[PDB]
Amino acid sequence: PRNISREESLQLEGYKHACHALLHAPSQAKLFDRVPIRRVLLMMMRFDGRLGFPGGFVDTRDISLEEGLKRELEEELGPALATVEVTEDDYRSSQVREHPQKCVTHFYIKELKLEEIERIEAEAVNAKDHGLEVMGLIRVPLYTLRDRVGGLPAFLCNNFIGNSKSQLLYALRSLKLLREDQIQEVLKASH
Amino acid sequence: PRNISREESLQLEGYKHACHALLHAPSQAKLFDRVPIRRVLLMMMRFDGRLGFPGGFVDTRDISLEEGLKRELEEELGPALATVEVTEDDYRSSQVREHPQKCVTHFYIKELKLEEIERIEAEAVNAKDHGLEVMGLIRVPLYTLRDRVGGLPAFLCNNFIGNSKSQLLYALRSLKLLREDQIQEVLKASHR
Ligand SMILES: [Mn+2]
Ligand SMILES: [Mn+2]
Ligand SMILES: [Mn+2]
Ligand SMILES: [Mn+2]
Ligand SMILES: [Mn+2]
Ligand SMILES: [Mn+2]
Ligand SMILES: [Mn+2]
């Protein structure tokens, strides 16, 4: 894909748009009582056997990017999202491609309280798309284990849809979770 | 990994033992009202960023391979499992390996009702290991989409722990969900 501004992407004609969101909350939990979780980051296994972020297509002639995302988040993540307001303030980036098809992808990042993310996971099973478009929700491991591979580097060898891996890596840098050198180390160990 | 009898494996001192289980249930659901789900098969995202089946290390001097499995299932999947039977009749295969620790793995396949699986997924959030060892449950796509890659072939390109991928393909044949040529077709399509 190619980087584009929101305003520029919204002036385009004959492009399909999609919105996807990273929902996250801080955690005081420690794996094996020693390895800090740091933060809960939500992704999903999709119907197509690839990992991704919740969200989907939006017809911007009908509804705003935010309204489209909202509807798609309720379908995929479930009832608990009616208490969540992902707004324009949560918008981060847009990327554009022309092949195979003209598509713009918008990426949102929204911090929640831990209890809020926990409620989302608990009610995700009740989503309209559970066991269909959505095959399950997963947390992203942020740590690297002692073997220097387990955790995030191994996670990054899974199968990701579209530019979702790049969006994840963007969030990690954006949220100041990992330094640039740390991101490169994680990608080296992964490959 | 190498195939080994259950009877032979327990008499092999110095080896560590682990037990893992495929819990599954039939389904009448259709993806996009078109592609039959056929069956719900449970796997998980692990703390280590790999996909696997629920279960884990079982001390053989402690109790039976069944008992060690049942406690891990409750630990990983939650309190719903206390009610789930589990028996030697659910045992399927054992694999032994030397490289990277001496390890015997036992594979279990148990068919449940769809409601039971649904209840399991719904209370998984309550499991001692949710958000720790277990990063979330997932269902396995059994179908292949029109592009001939999406669904099962794409799913098999994920990162699988140990021989869990081998184990899954065994189950797909074992439960007669795919023939051998069909399995060979998804593996090539996957690796392409
Ligand atoms: Mn979607
Ligand atoms: Mn959707
Ligand atoms: Mn949609
Ligand atoms: Mn385990
Ligand atoms: Mn365990
Ligand atoms: Mn453990
Ligand atoms: Mn254990």
Curated annotation (Swiss-Prot), chain A:
Enzyme class label: hydrolase
Tissue-wise expression: Detected in ovary, and at very low levels in epithelial cells (at protein level).
Binding site for Mn(2+) 2: 72
Database matches in Gene3D superfamilies: Nucleoside Triphosphate Pyrophosphohydrolase
UniProt family annotation: Belongs to the Nudix hydrolase family. NUDT16 subfamily.
Subunit structure: Homodimer.
Result when mutating residue 76 to Q: Strongly reduced activity; no effect on RNA-binding
Effect annotated for changing residue 133 to Q: Loss of activity; no effect on RNA-binding
Name by which UniProt lists this protein: U8 snoRNA-decapping enzyme
Keyword annotations of the record: Cytoplasm, Hydrolase, Magnesium, Manganese, Metal-binding, Nucleotide metabolism, Nucleotide-binding, Nucleus, RNA-binding
Cofactor: record remark: Binds 3 or 4 divalent metal cations. Acts specifically on U8 snoRNA with magnesium as cofactor. Has broad substrate specificity with bound manganese or cobalt (in vitro).
Binding annotation for Mn(2+) 4: 133
GO-annotated molecular function: 5'-(N(7)-methylguanosine 5'-triphospho)-[mRNA] hydrolase activity; cobalt ion binding; dIDP phosphatase activity; dITP diphosphatase activity; IDP phosphatase activity; magnesium ion binding; manganese ion binding; metalloexopeptidase activity
Binding site for substrate: 20, 46, 53, 163, 167
EC number: 3.6.1.62, 3.6.1.64
The protein's required cofactors: Mg(2+); Mn(2+); Co(2+)
pH dependence, record text: Optimum pH is 8.5-9.
Classification via PROSITE patterns: NUDIX (PS51462)
Function according to Swiss-Prot or TrEMBL: RNA-binding and decapping enzyme that catalyzes the cleavage of the cap structure of snoRNAs and mRNAs in a metal-dependent manner. Part of the U8 snoRNP complex that is required for the accumulation of mature 5.8S and 28S rRNA. Has diphosphatase activity and removes m7G and/or m227G caps from U8 snoRNA and leaves a 5'monophosphate on the RNA. Also catalyzes the cleavage of the cap structure on mRNAs. Does not hydrolyze cap analog structures like 7-methylguanosine nucleoside triphosphate (m7GpppG). Also hydrolysis m7G- and m227G U3-capped RNAs but with less efficiencies.
Result, substituting residue 75 to Q: Reduced activity; no effect on RNA-binding
Binding residues annotated for Mn(2+) 3, in chain numbering: 72, 76, 133
